[PDB]
Design goal:
The structure is a homotrimer. Helices cover 47% and strands 18% of the residues of chain A. In chain A, helix 2 (67-76) links the parallel strand 3 and strand 4. Chain A is built from 9 helices and 9 strands. The radius of gyration of chain A is 16 Å and the shape is globular. Chain A has one domain (1-209): 2-enoyl-CoA Hydratase, Chain A, domain 1 (Alpha-Beta Complex), CATH 3.90.226.10. By secondary structure, the first copy, chain A, is an alpha/beta fold. The termini of chain A are far apart. A 6-stranded mixed beta sheet of chain A has the order 1-2-3-4-6-9, sandwiched between helices. The longest helix of chain A is centred in the first third of the chain and has 16 residues, at 29-44. Chains in contact: A-B, A-C, B-C. The PDB classes it as isomerase. Keywords: Isomerase, Fatty acid oxidation, crotonase superfamily. The assembly is trimeric. The entry is titled "Crystal Structure of MSMEG_3139, a monofunctional enoyl CoA isomerase from M.smegmatis". Chains A, B, C: Enoyl-CoA hydratase/isomerase.
Chain lengths: 209, 209, 209
């Protein structure tokens, strides 16, 4: 009945579930705003070392902009965010997954860019070519085709694709491994990675303080 | 007898053929300048939704700079450009293909960087690592080796590799699919993609107007 | 007994061996400083066309910063540098390999990011996502897992993976091929490639002089 659920069962992990499976967790206002407030809170929760983000039901997400705020909130966390893509990641849903630090896909997952200049398409146009190279990003976005989970793994859109039944535990297993590193160590890795993408030059980035 | 041919057989599509098969469509002045003027015209033709670019004969192209003007003209089109790489794409020819939005290769195609600071090598050095990653771009350009069509598909230099006999119709099939999207929608996708490559940061790009 | 060895057996090639196999050629001060001085000398040696960099013993390298100076010295050479990754490339060792122009791996090799804001992690965070895309770079660096030589080749972290016994000769064969191009031609290719990575835009890069 809540639009975004939080699960703190596992030590050091916050499992966040987009919860309107009826509408394929479409990123309407009443989903993205509570998500934004939760992401803000999680930033200050030092018991949480890793965030796993997933969708209730059949889809991950079918996707006055709040998506850009959410994207930057994900990036602002000192915790790594693992997207557990359990089903359809479409438009804003694909962009949300690309805003996470790691993606793992269920066999059931597929990915589509879709949709008017939106935060979603701007985010996609920045992040997708940097994930999978310009050739594949360009034709996927220009044809608007579906990318299945096997292809997503092959081309490096996700890190791994696993049986639907194994998805969350794979993510929990990865989170558990990440817990073994120090909180400031992991944070620095995440921060250098995202700022490395924006860096003007190699030398400038190496001079970062 | 014309050095660049235009074919408007298929609705919404302009098939452009580099036509000096004798010299493997080498990007001499008398080819690139008519191509440049045609690309300028196509920009204003609202009957054309998609451009397919290919070479006459055995090669795609064997490649006071006009290549840079052509590169920027391709990019300036609101229409997606599909390179139908039917054979040898060498030097300026590879750079021309990389300046298109999507590449499809015939079984017959192969790719080589070749050649004096040229627009070709500058364009390549920017575009190839962004297409296929720095490791592969660097050694392909530093060894100057041939890359066959099967490898090109594997590493994401092209989106697909198909039988020689099926090349153009695969491209027409993709163009036909792209026609289904609105003209301003497709345009925005192409524009965000190319400007995304040049963007200084994620956040700056998301603030684009 | 020297910490960095130079081998000029093969014409046009300088084979540089990191020589403290006892400590897995860890990039301590007494290794990196002589390497830095050697890289400086090699820059002025016009008999040397290609540099091959490798490690003595079982590892490539297990890795007040001098690593950043070494990184920029490698990049400053007009000669291509081929990393012959003969074993463990860990932390600064992986970053060193990523600072070379081409990587070839022995069957024996594996790669790990490891480690406090260091030149190593900054260099990695810039170079790894540009080599293999953000999805794989991010999870490899955030999980700190080992990447074996077969995977490294598959994802384009290295150009090729070969039997341990064949590693150096594969590199010598590639160097021999690179020798066939002119010294200023090869130099320009290397320079456009590295500056292309830092370029602000396609058009700006094409206007380079």
């Amino acid at each position: 009945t809540r639009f975004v659920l939080l699960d703190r069962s596992r030590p050091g992990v916050a499992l966040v579930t987009l919860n309107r499976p009826e509408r394929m967790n479409s990123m309407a206002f009443d989903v993205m705003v509570p998500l934004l407030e939760l992401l803000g809170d999680l930033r200050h929760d030092n018991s949480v070392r890793v965030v796993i983000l997933t969708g209730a039901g059949r889809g991950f997400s079918s996707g006055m902009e709040v998506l850009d705020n959410v994207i930057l909130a994900l990036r602002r966390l000192h915790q790594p965010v693992i997207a557990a893509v359990n089903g359809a990641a479409i438009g804003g849903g694909l962009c949300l997954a690309l805003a996470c630090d790691v993606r793992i896909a269920a066999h059931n997952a597929y990915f589509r860019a879709a949709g008017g200049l939106t935060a979603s398409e701007l985010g996609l146009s920045y992040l997708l070519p940097r994930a999978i190279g310009t050739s594949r990003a360009f034709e996927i976005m220009l044809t608007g085709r579906d990318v299945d989970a096997a292809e997503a793994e092959r081309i490096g859109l996700v890190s791994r694709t696993v049986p639907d039944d194994d998805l969350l535990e794979t993510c929990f297993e990865m989170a558990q491994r990440m817990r073994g590193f120090s909180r400031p160590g992991i944070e620095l890795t995440k921060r250098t990675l995202w700022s490395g993408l924006d860096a003007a030059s190699l030398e400038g980035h190496m001079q970062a303080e």
